[PDB]
Amino acid sequence: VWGHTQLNRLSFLETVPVVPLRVSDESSEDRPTWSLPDIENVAITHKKPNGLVDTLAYRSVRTCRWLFDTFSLYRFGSITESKVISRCLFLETVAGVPGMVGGMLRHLSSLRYMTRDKGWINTLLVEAENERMHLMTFIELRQPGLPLRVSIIITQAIMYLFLLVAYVISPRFVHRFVGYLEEEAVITYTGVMRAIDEGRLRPTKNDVPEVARVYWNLSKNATFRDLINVIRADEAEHRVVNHTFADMHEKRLQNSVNPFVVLK
């Protein structure tokens, strides 16, 4: 019931105390829809760099992971749920910057050049949201200390600054950098799943948060393993979309149709 009578009212500020906090309202209605036993066979891939931009993208991602796994100490001593949930908490904060700077920029360009965008913006904005929902889920499982909260604030100041300037100069580099990020994400989350299937990591967070259960249309019988499965699937999707987008830039197809709009 949204009509002229509501459009003509000045404010609905006086309605806020009678509207419920529902978990389905945290995202848009564009929710992934994975079937677990199919997404079980998401695999680990590597796209070959084309030339100098692509080598830059990959070396920067590899340099970043080696720094990150070494400083965060992920490597030595056994995997645990605490360092898994911890790691993801941190990285999912950065994770939703690229897609948002991307869609913001294609949006601004579409507005100033009065051109069509042909389905790109929506894909990058929903991507940004997806990653943000990754964050929302992990923060139901672990609430961070102050050091990690301060690190997250500064890490955003730098990556937003990096990504904004990187995307104005070379959208190709950004999409490719992201493609290569999600390659590592799919590796990490398949590490998580493998350590579970092998009993090396006995997960305890098996009451999947409500936020995630409605976001991924997961049953109440979904476990931690299933949550990591559907997150990893999301990551892989971003892996392809981004490498695809970068490729389109490489071929001067950046003003072409978003192929994923129809593959849908």
Added chain:
Amino acid sequence: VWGHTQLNRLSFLETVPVVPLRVSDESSEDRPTWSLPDIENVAITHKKPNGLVDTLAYRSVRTCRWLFDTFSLYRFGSITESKVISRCLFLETVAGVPGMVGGMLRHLSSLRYMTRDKGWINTLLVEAENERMHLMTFIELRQPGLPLRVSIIITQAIMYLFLLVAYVISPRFVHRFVGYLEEEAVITYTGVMRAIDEGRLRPTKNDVPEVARVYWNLSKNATFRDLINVIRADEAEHRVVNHTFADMHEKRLQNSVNPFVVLK
């Protein structure tokens, strides 16, 4: 058909030449849904400023309209379709900046503070899209000269800069400024409709563009008058949402639920 086999492919760049350019792909599937004879009675309103921020917002909007109508010469000599379509072309370029800076910023804040956003971001992003589709429609009707294309590029450089810094400092001012923008938008577009109903402006662009016909689920028998009706309705919706949002900031409800998520 989106599964592990597609998630595991590296790129779909080789599919782009076999995917059609459909007008429905230009937006997301979150389309307004107005009934013409109801939205016919959208009216002209004015929210009273609360205090200094609100007076600033309104005076800046009034100062901007008086400059704009005077320099653009909208005032003297009769209304025409050419100056109507022209005016809107220009203003709809700015029109979709606020909502995008808004959602980008609430998104970034949600990511760095690991907090819930409770349905706000999606509303501002879809708003930004809505205005952008206003732009897409008007550019089917009139293609601008170079002077206006150069003015649009510079006007974005300034408003994006203004709005970004304004929203970091006072989201309340921005939402309120926007509220007051849409007040004028609803006035302009009801001027358009009234000049039509009175024969002062005999519109010729009566083959509503395909982009708009699918975006607003308008029939092939929709005329120019109907297009302006549904644009004006959209504007009024933004008028309320924004004043509502500003009000929530005024009351320190900025971390509360987006009331519109449920009013839906």
